[PDB]
Design a protein around this ligand. Structure first.
Ligand SMILES: Nc1ncnc2c1ncn2[C@@H]1O[C@H](COP(=O)(O)O)[C@@H](O)[C@H]1O
Ligand SMILES: Nc1ncnc2c1ncn2[C@@H]1O[C@H](COP(=O)(O)O)[C@@H](O)[C@H]1O
Ligand SMILES: [Fe+3]
Ligand SMILES: [Fe+3]
Ligand SMILES: [Mn+2]
Ligand SMILES: [Mn+2]
Lengths: 295, 295
């Protein structure tokens, strides 16, 4: 048997974004049941047997920062995370309310301070940054937050660092996005350049997109509720009930892979290969996959 | 008015992959009309008003390398490219036949030599590499191809280089992919490291995914015909008639952005903003977008 080109990943994370839940049972913007769309995705991820180390939600958790929306989100997601054996990482978006999020999602005293946090998953550092501006929809990072971030990044983590935030430091293909983009990205760039940040996870755009920022890969997950139609007349914008999903993040020794998970379904094309059949076929092709260092 | 954080892009490319057309009118694998799926996408891209510099197809153009499939593909795509004012870049995949592709897609003498090519779009270099192995489905790059590639990359291009190939030098989240992955990626890595390659465009996986390879961003476009369901039981694989589309590539002065374009459609959620309305709203927000250097 010959080894495959890459080993199993060191870490696996789910990257979900822009859930936009509202209080009670009404359709988001009268057009899409955001609870249903998120619920369907979670159930599909659960049934797949995926066992991620962490689940990161990159902002716009509650469409109007409603306590009832946070309570509902927590009720859907906590049992999901527990069933998967995964740590849960929450991030502020422009639609969220810092105080209500703290109270109802985190069981923490209400505060209007930026939701900036750090944690470790074994040797992998996760930094949560709050790009939200209360009462506003564009992104900003205060001088104080940049100082805090620089101080945290003064030393590297063994498996490097994932930075999770809402407003991505990248260009958008949609013109309207500039009205509410992250401002003064140069200042963030000066802080991040040359640090151990291996991935920047973001949302806000409601489509799947990726780029680099000061040499660091940025990955924007699409939304669970509704997504931008990128076949819209050039210059315009149209959200639609379609193409929802999330992302999967695989951290390898030498690279980070981001993959788009659309909602499951659609009629089968080609041959379905069961996990057992796949194991047999791989062996029969004379290949084995080297186990994870964290196996 | 204040300038947006990023200018208009220097270059725009469409990145399409894995069309898998067959001769005649039958459904691909008896399950999906690949002509219809590709046709719908092309018509949507056409109607959007997008004007890309180039359209790059990263392999598996014809499902069984059929002359009739190449003739049909050319008949669909050439008028599309001409209407958009875009250059057309074709790439070999494992399903393609080098000789039939040359004859029927390129009007070139049949040859079984690797389809390795280079061209310029103004100051942007595009290198096409052939990772296919005749009679086989895994990827390989011959020593001779690596030597050719190193020699080409000995000097940089003004806007850097896009490398287009089929089998991506990245891990897959699907176990079965290892049986047909690109072999000996280390050898390619030694050639590419420290060169002006700004993006590696790839296909083969039939899902949207991205990573880095020796510090270079790799972007894998999903397929136009059928795509992998990433909610499949862990370890398994299931292709499905759903989530088809292509990618859009925006080359900026300082970064390259890849964006996923799913098939258009779905009911509108939120407010539709026309291009004219967007221009008005952006101005009213006190912002302008700096024009492209190639405007
Ligand atoms: N009228 C609008 N104003 C600002 N952003 C919009 C508008 N319509 C659509 N968008 C898009 O929606 C994204 C912000 O979504 P959200 O923060 O959920 O409201 C932006 O990045 C834009 O691409
Ligand atoms: N039996 C199989 N053998 C190899 N690859 C498979 C199989 N079933 C699904 N695939 C997937 O299909 C991709 C190759 O597609 P293609 O080159 O179009 O045949 C691989 O990267 C795998 O992820
Ligand atoms: Fe949002
Ligand atoms: Fe293919
Ligand atoms: Mn947002
Ligand atoms: Mn292929």
């Amino acid at each position: 048997l010959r080894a495959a080109e890459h080993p199993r990943p060191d870490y696996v994370l789910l990257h979900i974004s822009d859930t936009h839940l509202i209080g009670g049972d009404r359709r988001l913007y009268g057009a899409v049941d955001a609870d249903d769309r998120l619920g369907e995705l979670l159930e599909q991820l659960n049934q797949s047997g995926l066992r991620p180390d962490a689940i990161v939600f990159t902002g716009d958790l509650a469409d109007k920062g409603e306590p009832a929306a946070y309570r509902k989100l927590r009720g859907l997601v906590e049992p999901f995370a527990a069933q998967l054996g995964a740590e849960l990482v929450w991030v502020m978006g422009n639609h969220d309310d810092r105080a209500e999020l703290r109270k109802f999602l985190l069981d923490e005293a209400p505060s209007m301070a930026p939701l900036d946090r750090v944690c470790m998953i074994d040797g992998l550092r996760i930094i949560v940054l709050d790009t939200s501006v209360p009462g506003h929809h564009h992104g900003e990072i205060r001088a104080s937050q940049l100082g805090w971030l620089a101080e945290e990044l003064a030393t590297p983590a063994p498996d490097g660092t994932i930075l999770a935030l809402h407003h991505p430091p990248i260009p958008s293909v949609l013109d309207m996005a500039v009205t509410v983009e992250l401002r003064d990205q140069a200042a963030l760039g000066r802080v991040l350049r040359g640090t151990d940040v291996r991935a920047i996870l973001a949302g806000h755009l409601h489509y799947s997109t990726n780029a680099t920022f000061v040499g660091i890969p940025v990955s924007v997950a699409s939304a669970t509720c509704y997504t931008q139609d990128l076949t819209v007349a050039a210059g315009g914008t149209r959200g639609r009930d379609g193409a929802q999903g999330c992302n999967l993040v695989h951290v390898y020794p030498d690279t980070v892979v981001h993959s788009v998970i659309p909602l499951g379904g659609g009629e089968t094309v080609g041959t379905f290969v069961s996990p057992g059949q796949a194991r047999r076929k791989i062996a029969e092709s004379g290949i084995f996959i080297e186990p994870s260092r964290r196996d």
